[PDB]
Coordinates of C-alpha atoms in Angstrom, one line a residue:
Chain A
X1 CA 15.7 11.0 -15.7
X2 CA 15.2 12.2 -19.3
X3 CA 15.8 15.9 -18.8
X4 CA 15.3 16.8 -15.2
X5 CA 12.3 18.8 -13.9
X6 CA 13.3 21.6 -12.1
X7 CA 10.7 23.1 -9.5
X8 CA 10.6 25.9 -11.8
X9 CA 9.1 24.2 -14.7
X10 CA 6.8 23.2 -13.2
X11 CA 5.6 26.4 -11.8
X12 CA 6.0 27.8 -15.4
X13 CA 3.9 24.8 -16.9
X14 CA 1.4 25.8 -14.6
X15 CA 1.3 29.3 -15.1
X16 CA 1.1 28.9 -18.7
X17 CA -1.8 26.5 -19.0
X18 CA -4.4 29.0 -18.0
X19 CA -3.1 31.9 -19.8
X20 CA -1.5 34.0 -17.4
X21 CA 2.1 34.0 -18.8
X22 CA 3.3 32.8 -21.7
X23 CA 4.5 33.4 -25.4
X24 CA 2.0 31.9 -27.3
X25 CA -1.0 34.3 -25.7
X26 CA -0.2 37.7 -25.7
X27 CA 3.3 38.4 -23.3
X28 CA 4.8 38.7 -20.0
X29 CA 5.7 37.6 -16.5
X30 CA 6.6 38.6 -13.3
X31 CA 9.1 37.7 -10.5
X32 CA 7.0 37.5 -7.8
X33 CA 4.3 35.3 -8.7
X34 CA 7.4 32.9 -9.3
X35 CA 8.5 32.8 -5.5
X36 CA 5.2 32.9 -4.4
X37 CA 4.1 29.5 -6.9
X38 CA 7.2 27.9 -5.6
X39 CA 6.7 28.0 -2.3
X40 CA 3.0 26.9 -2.7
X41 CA 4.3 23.9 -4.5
X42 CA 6.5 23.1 -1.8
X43 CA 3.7 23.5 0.8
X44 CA 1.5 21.0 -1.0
X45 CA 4.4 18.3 -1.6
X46 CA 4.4 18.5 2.2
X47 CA 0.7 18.2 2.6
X48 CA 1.0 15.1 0.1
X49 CA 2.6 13.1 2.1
X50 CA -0.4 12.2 4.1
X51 CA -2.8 11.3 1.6
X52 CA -1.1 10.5 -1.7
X53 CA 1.8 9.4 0.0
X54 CA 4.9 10.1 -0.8
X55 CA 6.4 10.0 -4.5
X56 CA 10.2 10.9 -4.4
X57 CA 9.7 15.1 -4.0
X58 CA 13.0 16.4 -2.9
X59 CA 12.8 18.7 0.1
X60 CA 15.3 21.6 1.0
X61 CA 17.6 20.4 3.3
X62 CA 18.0 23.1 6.1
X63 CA 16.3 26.4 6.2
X64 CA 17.5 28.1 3.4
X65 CA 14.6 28.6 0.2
X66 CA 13.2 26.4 -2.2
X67 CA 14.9 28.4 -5.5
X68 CA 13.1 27.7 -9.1
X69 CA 16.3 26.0 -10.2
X70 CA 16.7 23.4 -8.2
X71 CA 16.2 19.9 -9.0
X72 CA 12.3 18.4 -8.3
X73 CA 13.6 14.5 -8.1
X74 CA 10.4 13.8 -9.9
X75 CA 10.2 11.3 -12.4
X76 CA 8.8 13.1 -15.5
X77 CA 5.3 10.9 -15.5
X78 CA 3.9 13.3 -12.8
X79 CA 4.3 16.5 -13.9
X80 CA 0.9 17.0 -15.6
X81 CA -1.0 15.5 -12.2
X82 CA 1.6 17.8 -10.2
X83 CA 1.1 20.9 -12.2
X84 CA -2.9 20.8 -12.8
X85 CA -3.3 19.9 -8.9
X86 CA -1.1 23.3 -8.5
X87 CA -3.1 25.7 -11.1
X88 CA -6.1 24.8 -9.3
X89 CA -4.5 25.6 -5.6
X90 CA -3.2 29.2 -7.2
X91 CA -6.0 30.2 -9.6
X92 CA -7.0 31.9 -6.6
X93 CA -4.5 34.7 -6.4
X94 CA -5.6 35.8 -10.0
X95 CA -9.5 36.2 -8.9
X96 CA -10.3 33.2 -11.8
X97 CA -12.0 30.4 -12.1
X98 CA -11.4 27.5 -14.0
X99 CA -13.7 25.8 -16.9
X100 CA -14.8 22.7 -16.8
X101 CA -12.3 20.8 -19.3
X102 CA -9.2 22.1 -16.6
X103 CA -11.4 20.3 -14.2
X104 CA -11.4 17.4 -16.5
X105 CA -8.0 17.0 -17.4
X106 CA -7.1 17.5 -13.7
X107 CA -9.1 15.1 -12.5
X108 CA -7.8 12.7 -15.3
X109 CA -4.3 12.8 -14.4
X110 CA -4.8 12.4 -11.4
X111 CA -5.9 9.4 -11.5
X112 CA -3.5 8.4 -13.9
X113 CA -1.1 9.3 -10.5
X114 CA -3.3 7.4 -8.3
X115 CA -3.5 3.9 -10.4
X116 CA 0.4 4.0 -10.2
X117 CA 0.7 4.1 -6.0
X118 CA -2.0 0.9 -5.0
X119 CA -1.4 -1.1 -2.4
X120 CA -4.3 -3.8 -2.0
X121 CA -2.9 -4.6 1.1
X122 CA -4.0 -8.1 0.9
X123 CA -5.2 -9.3 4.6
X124 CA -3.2 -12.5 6.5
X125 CA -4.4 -15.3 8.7
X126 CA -4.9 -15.1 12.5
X127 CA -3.0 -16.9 14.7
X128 CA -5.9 -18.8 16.5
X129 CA -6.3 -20.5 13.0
X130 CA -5.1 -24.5 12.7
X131 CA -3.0 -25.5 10.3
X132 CA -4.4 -29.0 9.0
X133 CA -3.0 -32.3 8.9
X134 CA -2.8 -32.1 5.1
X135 CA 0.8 -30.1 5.3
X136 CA 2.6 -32.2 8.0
X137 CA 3.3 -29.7 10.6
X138 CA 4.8 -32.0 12.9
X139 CA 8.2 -32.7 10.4
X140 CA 8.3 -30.8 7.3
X141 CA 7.4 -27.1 9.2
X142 CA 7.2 -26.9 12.6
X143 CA 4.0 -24.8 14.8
X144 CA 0.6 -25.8 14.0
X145 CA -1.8 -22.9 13.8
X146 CA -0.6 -19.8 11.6
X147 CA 2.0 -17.3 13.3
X148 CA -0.4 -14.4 12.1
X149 CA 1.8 -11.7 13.0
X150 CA 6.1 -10.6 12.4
Chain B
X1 CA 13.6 -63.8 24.6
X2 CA 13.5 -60.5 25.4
X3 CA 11.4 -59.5 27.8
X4 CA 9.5 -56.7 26.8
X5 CA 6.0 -57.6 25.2
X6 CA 3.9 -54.4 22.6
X7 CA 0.6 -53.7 22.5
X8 CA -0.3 -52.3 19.3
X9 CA -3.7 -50.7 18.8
X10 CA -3.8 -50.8 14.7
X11 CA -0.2 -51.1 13.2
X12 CA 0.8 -51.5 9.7
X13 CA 4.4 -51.7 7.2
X14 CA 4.1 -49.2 4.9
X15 CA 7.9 -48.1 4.0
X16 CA 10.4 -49.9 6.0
X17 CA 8.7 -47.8 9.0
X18 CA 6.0 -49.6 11.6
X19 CA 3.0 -47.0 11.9
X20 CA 1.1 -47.5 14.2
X21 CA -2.6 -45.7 15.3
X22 CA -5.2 -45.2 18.0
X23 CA -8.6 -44.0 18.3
X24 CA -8.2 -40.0 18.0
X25 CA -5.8 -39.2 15.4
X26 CA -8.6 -39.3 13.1
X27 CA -11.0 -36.6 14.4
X28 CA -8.4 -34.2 15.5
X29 CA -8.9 -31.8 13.2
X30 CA -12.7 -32.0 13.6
X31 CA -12.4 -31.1 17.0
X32 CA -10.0 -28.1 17.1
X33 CA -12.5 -26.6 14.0
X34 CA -15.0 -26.6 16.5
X35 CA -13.6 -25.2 19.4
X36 CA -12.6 -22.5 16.8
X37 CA -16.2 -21.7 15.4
X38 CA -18.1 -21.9 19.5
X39 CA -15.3 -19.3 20.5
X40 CA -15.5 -17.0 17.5
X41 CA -19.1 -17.1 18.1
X42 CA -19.3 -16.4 21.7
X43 CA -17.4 -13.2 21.9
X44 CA -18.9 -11.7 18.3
X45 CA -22.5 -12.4 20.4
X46 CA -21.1 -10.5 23.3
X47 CA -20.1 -7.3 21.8
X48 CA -23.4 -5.7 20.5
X49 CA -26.0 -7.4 23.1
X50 CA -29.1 -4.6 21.9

């Protein structure tokens, strides 16, 4: 896609939007609270693929660790849903809690993530059912009564 | 001649085809809707009795 999200940025984007590190507050940040947001991100992409579903994360292939620069595979439409969904699982670590507009804007996108994963899953006929008269099932198709199933 | 003598109940020339039709035909469909609704009903009665 357009530039790539790395699992790092989105760590960073997270960390940023509540003050914790970033230029444009006062200074700072710290190594470990890097490894330690990674690997919380990669434990909820897990967990997401139960309820959300999944969405094209890219797992580790083997043991080996996560890393911040490594690519994400996500397309760059879900990194506000993925990164306010995260700031909320780590505010923890910090002792904080968030205000209500992070509430708001997280619950925003994530429905903006949500409209673009429906299904509707649109429910068939039986199999007990008859087909009428009207569509010729003796020559132009063949079985009378819906199949209902494959 | 030959030999062999039909017995048509209602037959008519419609496209260079003989159709022919008895008594039934007509309510088939009817029928088999019926059947459908008394056995949907029977077994939706029989699965909360109180």
């Amino acid at each position: 896609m357009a530039t790539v999200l790395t699992k790092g940025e989105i760590v960073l984007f997270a960390l940023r939007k509540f003050a914790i590190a970033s230029n444009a507050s006062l200074t700072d940040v710290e190594p470990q609270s890097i490894e330690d947001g990674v690997n919380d991100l990669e434990d909820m992409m897990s967990e997401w693929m139960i309820n959300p579903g999944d969405i094209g994360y890219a797992f580790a292939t083997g043991d080996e660790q996560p890393l911040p620069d490594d690519e994400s595979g996500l397309p760059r439409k879900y990194k506000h849903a993925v990164g306010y969904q995260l700031l909320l699982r780590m505010l923890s670590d910090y002792s904080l809690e968030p205000t209500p507009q992070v509430l708001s804007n997280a619950q925003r996108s994530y429905d903006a993530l949500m409209t673009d994963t429906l299904v509707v899953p649109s429910m068939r006929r039986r199999g007990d059912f008859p087909v009428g008269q009207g569509n010729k099932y003796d020559v132009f198709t063949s079985d009378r009564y819906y199949p209902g199933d494959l | 001649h030959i030999p062999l003598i039909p017995v048509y109940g209602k037959r008519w020339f419609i496209d260079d085809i003989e159709r022919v039709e008895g008594h039934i035909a007509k309510a088939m469909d009817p029928q088999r809707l019926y059947n459908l609704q008394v056995s949907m009903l029977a077994d939706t009665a029989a699965q909360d009795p109180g």
